Amino acid sequence: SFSNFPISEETIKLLKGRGVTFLFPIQAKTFHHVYSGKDLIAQARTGTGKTFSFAIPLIEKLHGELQDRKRGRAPQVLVLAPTRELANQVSKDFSDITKKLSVACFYGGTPYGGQFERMRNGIDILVGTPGRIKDHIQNGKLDLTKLKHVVLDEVDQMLDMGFADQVEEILSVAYKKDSEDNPQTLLFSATCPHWVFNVAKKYMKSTYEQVDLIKTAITVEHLAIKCHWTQRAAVIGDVIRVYSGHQGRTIIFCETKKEAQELSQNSAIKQDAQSLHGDIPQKQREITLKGFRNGSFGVLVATNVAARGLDIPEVDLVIQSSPPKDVESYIHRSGRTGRAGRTGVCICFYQHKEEYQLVQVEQKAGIKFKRI
Ligand SMILES: Nc1ncnc2c1ncn2[C@@H]1O[C@H](COP(=O)(O)OP(=O)(O)O)[C@@H](O)[C@H]1O
Ligand SMILES: [Mg+2]
């Protein structure tokens, strides 16, 4: 339900056709900022709902404001996205939830004439890629001097791809006034490097708001699996398939060389595993780590002895064979899990006689395990 937000019954019915029945956190925490006219930078992980976080409050805003839509009117909202595929998706999301507003999407690799006719007939929300939008400014057909809202979607990707200069050329036309008359500026992305914000800041009022759901996100899950030591190898095979699977990276830490050597020879993982312990001379240790990084094998079994000082690559899954005594090392290893934006998984095995040790790890690391 939508009781906390000024969303009309018409919009709610369209949202149901898209499977939307309540607002995700990034949407709920940004609605009032966007709707009330504040400049905003919002950061949330990929897939968490950034598109509707700007599209729903903007559409409700325009539905209240643009009661008299004349032929030829200039857009009120501009959304720049870095690829044709991303621009199309954002435009589709707008046009699925408003049947009142004129929504247009301008990208390259497509005819100019149809875009000319959208501009002649009138546009309320313009979505596009920077290149084609800049072309239409230069050819004199697109009027961006009456914008009230500007969205830079996936702004990190957009500037990484080289669009800073084209974006600045487009926005220079729309921010010709002093601040109070400038468009509201909305930035949405999963990251915002320093150098990207240094570009965008030029278009943000000093009063801008920030919603960062990255800093509060659960990016590493801690699981504790109660297990007799004889079953560990078979369970390790299962959790590797679940959480690392194809093309994955797993590192297993154990106490003794015998455990590390036997675990790496166990038919549950042997075909994809190499071991690392204090008997291995430096040169082969280095060779083994290069093969772990370059995909030669997917499971590294290391004694806590060999792991002291070792530089740990990013991995999908960390497994501790028993609750670690060196919680500092555990905290460090857990921070290495989760690749390509995915949530990392750390698994601690434990036996009945080790259950209080799990509580000690929880206290010393300030975490809580999910017990399985
Ligand atoms: N409140 C919601 N309820 C249900 N599905 C949603 C909601 N918000 C977004 N989605 C869906 O989640 C998916 C990801 O949304 P998207 O805006 O692409 O995420 P992001 O831009 O954060 O990567 C889309 O299929 C979208 O329609
Ligand atoms: Mg998005």
Coordinates of C-alpha atoms and ligand atoms in Angstrom, one line a residue:
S1 CA 0.0 0.0 0.0
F2 CA 0.9 3.6 -0.5
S3 CA -0.9 5.4 2.4
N4 CA 2.2 7.5 3.3
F5 CA 2.6 9.0 -0.2
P6 CA 0.6 11.3 -2.5
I7 CA 0.0 8.7 -5.2
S8 CA -3.3 8.8 -7.0
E9 CA -5.7 5.9 -7.5
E10 CA -5.1 5.9 -11.2
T11 CA -1.3 5.7 -10.7
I12 CA -1.8 2.9 -8.2
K13 CA -3.8 0.9 -10.7
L14 CA -1.0 1.2 -13.3
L15 CA 1.6 0.3 -10.7
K16 CA -0.3 -2.9 -10.0
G17 CA 0.1 -3.8 -13.7
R18 CA 3.8 -3.6 -13.1
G19 CA 3.7 -5.7 -9.9
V20 CA 4.3 -2.7 -7.7
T21 CA 2.2 -2.8 -4.5
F22 CA 4.4 -0.9 -2.1
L23 CA 7.5 1.3 -2.2
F24 CA 11.0 -0.2 -1.8
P25 CA 13.3 1.5 0.7
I26 CA 15.1 3.6 -1.9
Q27 CA 11.7 4.8 -3.2
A28 CA 10.2 5.4 0.3
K29 CA 13.2 7.3 1.5
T30 CA 13.5 9.6 -1.5
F31 CA 9.8 10.3 -2.3
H32 CA 9.3 13.5 -0.2
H33 CA 12.7 14.9 -1.3
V34 CA 11.9 14.5 -4.9
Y35 CA 8.2 15.5 -4.7
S36 CA 9.0 18.6 -2.5
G37 CA 11.6 20.0 -5.0
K38 CA 14.9 19.3 -3.3
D39 CA 18.1 18.6 -5.1
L40 CA 19.1 15.0 -4.3
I41 CA 21.9 12.4 -4.6
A42 CA 20.6 8.9 -4.0
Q43 CA 22.7 5.8 -4.0
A44 CA 21.4 2.2 -3.9
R45 CA 22.6 -1.1 -5.2
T46 CA 21.7 -2.3 -8.7
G47 CA 18.3 -3.8 -8.9
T48 CA 16.8 -2.0 -5.8
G49 CA 14.3 0.3 -7.6
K50 CA 16.0 3.6 -8.5
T51 CA 14.0 4.1 -11.6
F52 CA 10.6 4.4 -9.8
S53 CA 12.3 6.4 -7.0
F54 CA 12.4 9.4 -9.4
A55 CA 9.6 8.4 -11.9
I56 CA 6.7 8.0 -9.4
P57 CA 7.1 11.3 -7.5
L58 CA 7.9 13.3 -10.7
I59 CA 4.8 12.0 -12.5
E60 CA 2.5 12.8 -9.5
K61 CA 4.1 16.3 -9.4
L62 CA 3.5 16.9 -13.1
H63 CA -0.1 15.5 -13.0
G64 CA -0.8 18.2 -10.4
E65 CA 1.0 21.0 -12.2
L66 CA 0.5 20.6 -16.0
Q67 CA -3.3 20.9 -16.2
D68 CA -3.0 22.8 -19.6
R69 CA -0.7 20.9 -22.0
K70 CA -0.5 22.8 -25.3
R71 CA 0.9 21.6 -28.6
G72 CA 4.6 22.3 -29.0
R73 CA 5.3 22.6 -25.3
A74 CA 8.9 22.1 -24.2
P75 CA 9.8 19.3 -21.7
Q76 CA 9.5 19.8 -18.0
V77 CA 11.7 16.7 -17.1
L78 CA 14.9 15.6 -18.6
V79 CA 16.5 12.2 -17.9
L80 CA 19.9 11.5 -19.3
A81 CA 21.0 7.8 -19.3
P82 CA 24.3 6.5 -20.7
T83 CA 23.0 3.8 -23.1
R84 CA 20.1 3.3 -25.5
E85 CA 19.0 0.2 -23.6
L86 CA 19.0 2.1 -20.2
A87 CA 17.2 5.1 -21.8
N88 CA 14.5 2.8 -23.3
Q89 CA 13.9 1.1 -20.0
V90 CA 13.5 4.4 -18.1
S91 CA 11.1 5.8 -20.7
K92 CA 9.1 2.6 -20.7
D93 CA 8.7 2.8 -16.9
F94 CA 7.4 6.4 -17.2
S95 CA 5.0 5.6 -20.0
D96 CA 3.7 2.5 -18.1
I97 CA 2.6 4.6 -15.1
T98 CA 1.2 7.7 -16.7
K99 CA -1.4 7.8 -19.5
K100 CA -1.7 11.6 -19.3
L101 CA 1.9 12.9 -20.0
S102 CA 3.8 12.9 -23.3
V103 CA 6.9 10.7 -22.7
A104 CA 9.7 10.7 -25.4
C105 CA 12.9 8.8 -25.6
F106 CA 15.7 10.1 -27.9
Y107 CA 18.8 7.9 -28.6
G108 CA 21.1 7.3 -31.6
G109 CA 20.9 4.6 -34.2
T110 CA 17.3 5.7 -35.0
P111 CA 15.6 8.1 -37.4
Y112 CA 15.6 11.8 -36.7
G113 CA 12.2 12.6 -38.2
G114 CA 10.0 10.8 -35.6
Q115 CA 11.9 12.7 -32.9
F116 CA 11.3 16.0 -34.7
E117 CA 7.6 15.3 -34.6
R118 CA 7.5 14.5 -30.9
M119 CA 9.1 17.9 -30.3
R120 CA 6.6 19.6 -32.6
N121 CA 3.6 18.0 -30.9
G122 CA 4.9 18.6 -27.4
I123 CA 6.8 16.7 -24.7
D124 CA 6.5 16.6 -20.9
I125 CA 9.2 14.0 -20.0
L126 CA 12.2 13.6 -22.2
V127 CA 14.5 10.6 -21.7
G128 CA 17.6 10.2 -23.8
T129 CA 21.3 9.6 -24.3
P130 CA 23.6 12.7 -24.3
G131 CA 24.7 12.5 -27.9
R132 CA 21.3 12.6 -29.6
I133 CA 19.9 15.1 -27.1
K134 CA 22.9 17.4 -27.7
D135 CA 22.3 17.1 -31.5
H136 CA 18.7 18.4 -31.1
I137 CA 19.8 21.3 -29.0
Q138 CA 22.4 22.3 -31.6
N139 CA 20.0 21.9 -34.5
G140 CA 17.6 24.4 -32.8
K141 CA 14.6 22.0 -32.4
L142 CA 14.8 21.1 -28.7
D143 CA 14.0 23.7 -26.0
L144 CA 15.6 22.8 -22.7
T145 CA 15.3 26.3 -21.2
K146 CA 12.0 25.5 -19.4
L147 CA 13.0 22.4 -17.5
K148 CA 11.9 22.0 -13.9
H149 CA 13.6 18.7 -13.2
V150 CA 16.8 17.0 -14.4
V151 CA 17.7 13.4 -13.7
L152 CA 21.2 12.0 -14.2
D153 CA 20.6 8.2 -14.1
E154 CA 23.5 5.9 -13.6
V155 CA 25.7 9.0 -13.4
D156 CA 28.8 7.0 -12.5
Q157 CA 28.5 4.9 -15.6
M158 CA 27.7 7.9 -17.7
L159 CA 30.9 9.7 -16.8
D160 CA 33.0 6.6 -16.8
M161 CA 32.0 6.2 -20.5
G162 CA 33.2 9.7 -21.3
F163 CA 30.0 11.8 -21.4
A164 CA 31.1 14.5 -18.9
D165 CA 31.6 17.2 -21.6
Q166 CA 28.4 16.4 -23.5
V167 CA 26.4 16.4 -20.2
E168 CA 27.9 19.8 -19.3
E169 CA 27.0 21.2 -22.7
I170 CA 23.4 20.0 -22.4
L171 CA 23.0 21.3 -18.8
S172 CA 24.5 24.7 -19.5
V173 CA 21.4 25.4 -21.6
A174 CA 19.0 24.5 -18.8
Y175 CA 20.8 26.1 -15.8
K176 CA 21.0 29.6 -17.2
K177 CA 19.2 31.2 -14.2
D178 CA 20.3 31.7 -10.6
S179 CA 19.7 28.8 -8.2
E180 CA 16.0 29.5 -7.3
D181 CA 14.9 29.3 -10.9
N182 CA 17.2 26.4 -11.9
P183 CA 15.8 22.9 -12.4
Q184 CA 15.7 20.4 -9.5
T185 CA 18.8 18.2 -9.9
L186 CA 18.5 14.4 -9.1
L187 CA 21.4 12.0 -9.2
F188 CA 20.8 8.3 -9.0
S189 CA 23.5 5.5 -9.1
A190 CA 25.1 2.7 -7.2
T191 CA 28.4 4.5 -6.8
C192 CA 29.6 8.1 -7.0
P193 CA 33.4 8.5 -7.2
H194 CA 34.9 11.8 -6.0
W195 CA 35.7 12.9 -9.6
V196 CA 32.1 12.2 -10.7
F197 CA 30.5 14.3 -7.9
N198 CA 33.0 17.1 -8.7
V199 CA 31.4 17.4 -12.1
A200 CA 27.8 17.0 -10.9
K201 CA 28.2 19.3 -7.9
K202 CA 28.2 22.4 -10.3
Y203 CA 24.5 21.8 -10.9
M204 CA 23.5 21.0 -7.3
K205 CA 22.2 23.6 -4.8
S206 CA 24.1 23.8 -1.5
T207 CA 20.9 22.6 0.2
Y208 CA 20.9 19.2 -1.6
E209 CA 19.8 16.0 0.2
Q210 CA 21.6 12.7 0.3
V211 CA 20.1 9.2 0.6
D212 CA 22.8 6.6 0.8
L213 CA 21.4 3.0 1.2
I214 CA 24.8 1.6 0.3
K215 CA 26.4 2.4 3.7
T216 CA 23.5 0.7 5.5
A217 CA 23.2 -2.3 3.2
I218 CA 23.9 -5.9 4.3
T219 CA 26.7 -6.7 1.9
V220 CA 28.1 -9.8 3.7
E221 CA 26.1 -12.6 5.3
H222 CA 27.5 -14.5 8.2
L223 CA 26.3 -18.1 8.4
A224 CA 27.1 -20.7 11.1
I225 CA 26.5 -24.3 10.2
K226 CA 26.5 -26.9 13.0
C227 CA 28.3 -29.9 11.7
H228 CA 30.2 -32.9 12.9
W229 CA 33.8 -32.6 11.6
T230 CA 33.4 -35.8 9.5
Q231 CA 30.6 -34.2 7.4
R232 CA 32.5 -30.9 6.8
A233 CA 33.9 -31.8 3.4
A234 CA 30.6 -33.0 2.0
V235 CA 28.8 -29.9 3.3
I236 CA 31.6 -27.6 1.9
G237 CA 30.9 -29.1 -1.6
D238 CA 27.2 -28.2 -1.3
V239 CA 27.7 -24.7 -0.1
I240 CA 30.3 -24.0 -2.8
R241 CA 27.7 -25.1 -5.4
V242 CA 25.1 -22.9 -3.8
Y243 CA 27.1 -19.7 -3.3
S244 CA 30.1 -19.9 -5.6
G245 CA 29.1 -22.5 -8.3
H246 CA 30.3 -21.9 -11.9
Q247 CA 33.2 -19.5 -12.3
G248 CA 33.2 -18.8 -8.5
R249 CA 36.0 -18.2 -6.0
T250 CA 36.0 -19.9 -2.6
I251 CA 38.7 -19.8 0.1
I252 CA 38.6 -22.3 3.0
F253 CA 40.6 -21.6 6.2
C254 CA 41.5 -24.4 8.6
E255 CA 43.7 -25.0 11.6
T256 CA 46.1 -27.8 10.6
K257 CA 48.1 -28.7 7.5
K258 CA 46.6 -32.2 7.7
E259 CA 43.1 -30.8 7.6
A260 CA 44.0 -28.5 4.7
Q261 CA 45.8 -31.3 2.7
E262 CA 43.0 -33.8 3.3
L263 CA 40.2 -31.3 2.6
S264 CA 41.8 -30.4 -0.8
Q265 CA 42.1 -34.1 -1.7
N266 CA 38.5 -34.9 -0.7
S267 CA 36.5 -35.8 -3.8
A268 CA 33.9 -33.2 -2.9
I269 CA 36.3 -30.4 -4.0
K270 CA 39.6 -32.0 -5.1
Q271 CA 39.0 -31.5 -8.9
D272 CA 38.7 -27.7 -8.3
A273 CA 41.0 -27.2 -5.3
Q274 CA 44.6 -26.4 -4.3
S275 CA 46.0 -26.2 -0.8
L276 CA 48.4 -23.7 0.9
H277 CA 50.2 -24.4 4.1
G278 CA 53.5 -23.6 5.8
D279 CA 55.4 -26.5 4.2
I280 CA 54.8 -25.0 0.7
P281 CA 57.8 -23.0 -0.2
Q282 CA 57.3 -19.3 -1.2
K283 CA 57.6 -19.9 -4.9
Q284 CA 54.8 -22.5 -5.2
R285 CA 52.6 -20.4 -2.9
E286 CA 52.9 -17.5 -5.3
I287 CA 52.2 -19.8 -8.3
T288 CA 49.1 -21.2 -6.5
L289 CA 47.7 -17.7 -5.8
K290 CA 48.2 -16.6 -9.4
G291 CA 46.2 -19.6 -10.5
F292 CA 43.4 -18.8 -8.0
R293 CA 43.2 -15.3 -9.5
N294 CA 43.4 -16.2 -13.1
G295 CA 40.7 -18.9 -12.9
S296 CA 43.0 -22.0 -13.1
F297 CA 41.0 -23.4 -10.1
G298 CA 38.2 -22.2 -7.9
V299 CA 38.8 -23.4 -4.4
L300 CA 41.8 -22.5 -2.2
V301 CA 42.3 -24.3 1.0
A302 CA 44.7 -22.5 3.4
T303 CA 45.8 -23.1 6.9
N304 CA 45.5 -20.1 9.2
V305 CA 49.3 -20.4 9.3
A306 CA 49.8 -19.9 5.6
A307 CA 47.1 -17.2 5.6
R308 CA 49.0 -14.8 7.9
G309 CA 50.3 -12.0 5.7
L310 CA 48.6 -13.5 2.6
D311 CA 47.0 -10.9 0.2
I312 CA 43.5 -12.2 -0.2
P313 CA 41.8 -11.7 -3.6
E314 CA 38.1 -10.8 -3.8
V315 CA 36.1 -14.0 -3.5
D316 CA 32.5 -15.1 -3.5
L317 CA 32.6 -17.3 -0.4
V318 CA 34.8 -17.6 2.7
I319 CA 34.6 -20.7 4.9
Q320 CA 36.1 -21.2 8.3
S321 CA 36.4 -24.8 9.4
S322 CA 35.8 -23.8 13.1
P323 CA 35.1 -20.6 15.0
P324 CA 38.3 -18.5 14.5
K325 CA 40.5 -17.5 17.4
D326 CA 41.9 -14.6 15.3
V327 CA 38.8 -12.6 14.9
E328 CA 40.8 -9.8 13.4
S329 CA 41.7 -12.0 10.5
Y330 CA 38.1 -13.2 10.2
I331 CA 36.8 -9.6 10.0
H332 CA 39.4 -8.9 7.3
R333 CA 38.6 -12.0 5.3
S334 CA 34.9 -11.3 5.4
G335 CA 35.5 -7.9 3.9
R336 CA 36.9 -9.7 0.9
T337 CA 33.7 -11.5 0.0
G338 CA 31.2 -10.3 -2.6
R339 CA 32.2 -9.6 -6.2
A340 CA 30.5 -7.5 -8.9
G341 CA 28.1 -6.0 -6.5
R342 CA 26.9 -9.3 -5.1
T343 CA 26.4 -9.9 -1.4
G344 CA 29.3 -11.8 0.1
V345 CA 28.9 -15.0 2.2
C346 CA 31.0 -16.1 5.1
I347 CA 30.4 -19.5 6.6
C348 CA 31.7 -20.7 10.0
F349 CA 31.3 -24.4 10.8
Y350 CA 31.0 -25.4 14.4
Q351 CA 30.6 -28.5 16.6
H352 CA 28.6 -28.7 19.8
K353 CA 31.7 -28.2 21.9
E354 CA 32.5 -25.0 19.9
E355 CA 29.1 -23.3 20.3
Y356 CA 30.1 -20.8 22.9
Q357 CA 33.2 -19.9 20.8
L358 CA 30.7 -18.8 18.1
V359 CA 29.2 -16.4 20.6
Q360 CA 32.8 -15.1 21.4
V361 CA 33.3 -14.4 17.7
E362 CA 29.9 -12.6 17.5
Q363 CA 30.9 -10.4 20.4
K364 CA 34.5 -9.7 19.3
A365 CA 33.4 -9.0 15.7
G366 CA 30.2 -7.2 16.4
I367 CA 28.2 -9.5 14.2
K368 CA 25.3 -12.0 14.5
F369 CA 25.4 -15.4 12.7
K370 CA 22.5 -17.0 11.0
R371 CA 22.5 -20.4 12.6
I372 CA 21.8 -23.4 10.2
Ligands
LIG1 N1 8.3 -1.1 -5.4 C1 8.5 -2.1 -6.3 N2 7.8 -3.2 -6.3 C2 8.0 -4.2 -7.1 N3 9.0 -4.2 -8.1 C3 9.7 -3.1 -8.2 C4 9.5 -2.0 -7.4 N4 10.4 -1.0 -7.7 C5 11.1 -1.5 -8.7 N5 10.7 -2.8 -9.1 C6 11.2 -3.6 -10.1 O1 12.6 -4.0 -9.8 C7 13.4 -4.0 -11.0 C8 14.7 -3.2 -10.8 O2 14.3 -1.8 -10.8 P1 15.3 -0.7 -11.4 O3 14.6 0.6 -11.3 O4 15.8 -1.2 -12.7 O5 16.5 -0.8 -10.4 P2 17.9 0.0 -10.3 O6 17.7 1.2 -11.2 O7 18.0 0.4 -8.8 O8 18.9 -0.9 -10.8 C9 12.5 -3.6 -12.1 O9 11.9 -4.8 -12.7 C10 11.4 -2.8 -11.4 O10 10.2 -2.8 -12.2
MG2 MG 18.6 2.1 -12.8

